Amino acid sequence: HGYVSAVENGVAEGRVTLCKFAANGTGEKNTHCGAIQYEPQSVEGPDGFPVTGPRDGKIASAESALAAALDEQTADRWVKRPIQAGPQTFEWTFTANHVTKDWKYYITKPNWNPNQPLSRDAFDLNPFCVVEGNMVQPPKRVSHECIVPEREGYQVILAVWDVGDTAASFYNVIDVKFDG
Ligand SMILES: [Ca+2]
Ligand SMILES: [Cu+2]
């Protein structure tokens, strides 16, 4: 159990994280998140996106009944966090730092449609960042240095934490705003 955070080093909090914790700097929160707002660490879903795992339209919730509210997708629905292309650091905070297979990060395609539910077709399925977990426990907070591709405007990053000793992964979408 854990979530994408910006407590020590991260560039942008997960969408679910902002249902509970105020955004760095602005204090913005996401609203009307349903029950997941009390446990942003619990967006747990089946392994194997995009081959298996959460189906289209259920990616942001990872098919969790707790997090169903996160599957809404419009241009204005969610708090967007500023980002730039190039080197950036993403951060996970774990309430339970399970043995880890890897972390993978995907970004939406340049001309994705922010006004329809998220789907495999919205994302570049070639992950822009992969971090090996080596089937060991990570520390309770980790920072991953990634190269973020060039984009304009509103984009979504999908961060996947694959727990190595269960058939489950944690799925945190991130709402980011590039210049332009
Ligand atoms: Ca797993
Ligand atoms: Cu857990």
UniProtKB/Swiss-Prot annotation:
Instruction: Give the species.
Output: Vibrio cholerae serotype O1 (strain ATCC 39315 / El Tor Inaba N16961)
Tell me the compartments it is located in: Secreted
The similarity comment for this entry is: Belongs to the GbpA family.
**Name of the molecule in the record:** GlcNAc-binding protein A
Q: What does this protein do?
A: Probably interacts with GlcNAc residues. May promote attachment to both epithelial cell surfaces and chitin. This function enhances bacterial colonization in the gastrointestinal tract and may also be important in the environment by augment colonization of chitinous structures, leading to improved survival. Promotes bacterial attachment to, and colonization of, zooplankton in the aquatic ecosystem.
Report domain Chitin-binding type-4 positions.
1-178
